[PDB]
Write a protein that binds this ligand. Sequence first.
Ligand SMILES: CC(C)(COP(=O)(O)OP(=O)(O)OC[C@H]1O[C@@H](n2cnc3c(N)ncnc32)[C@H](O)[C@@H]1OP(=O)(O)O)[C@@H](O)C(=O)NCCC(=O)NCCS
Lengths: 6, 151
Amino acid sequence: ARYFRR
Amino acid sequence: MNTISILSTTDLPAAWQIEQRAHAFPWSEKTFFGNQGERYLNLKLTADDRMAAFAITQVVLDEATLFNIAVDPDFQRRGLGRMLLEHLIDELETRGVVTLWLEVRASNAAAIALYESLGFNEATIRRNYYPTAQGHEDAIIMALPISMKLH
Ligand SMILES: CC(C)(COP(=O)(O)OP(=O)(O)OC[C@H]1O[C@@H](n2cnc3c(N)ncnc32)[C@H](O)[C@@H]1OP(=O)(O)O)[C@@H](O)C(=O)NCCC(=O)NCCS
């Protein structure tokens, strides 16, 4: 899982 | 029976449910519904009736990043995760992709062991990349080389 600030 | 197919518009509400059930810190709805379209090779695994898993991947040039994989809790530890991952890898090889990349919580012993057994290696670590219920967790950045086959 990539983490987004979005 | 298990059936891996493309993840399309109609499939997204079911997958969004899976996203919120399988991740302690899921994406936001907008981010989730935004990771579709151009350059996405998104897959689902269907067990009989139900959607059991999904994977979000983006392909740029001859590398890919698996942004997300999720097996619904009801369907875990039954080999569906690996199976879906295996289908994706075959599919990327036919597409000329030579490296699959991903990020994983450093404490996800399950996911890491799966990836390791599929041939992933740790490339680099990003400290404090993930939030936790009590601070931050390290991210392990892992690369899987995909050998080219005859077609
Ligand atoms: C991790 C995940 C994607 C795959 O799980 P799955 O479909 O249950 O995995 P499989 O049944 O294909 O196999 C899991 C492999 O992980 C490793 N593993 C070690 N301990 C494990 C455990 N307690 N549970 C699951 N896997 C474990 C093994 O190599 C295992 O293969 P095995 O059958 O030879 O033991 C799924 O559990 C999930 O969605 N988890 C929550 C979300 C998540 O963490 N996603 C990945 C973020 S990087």
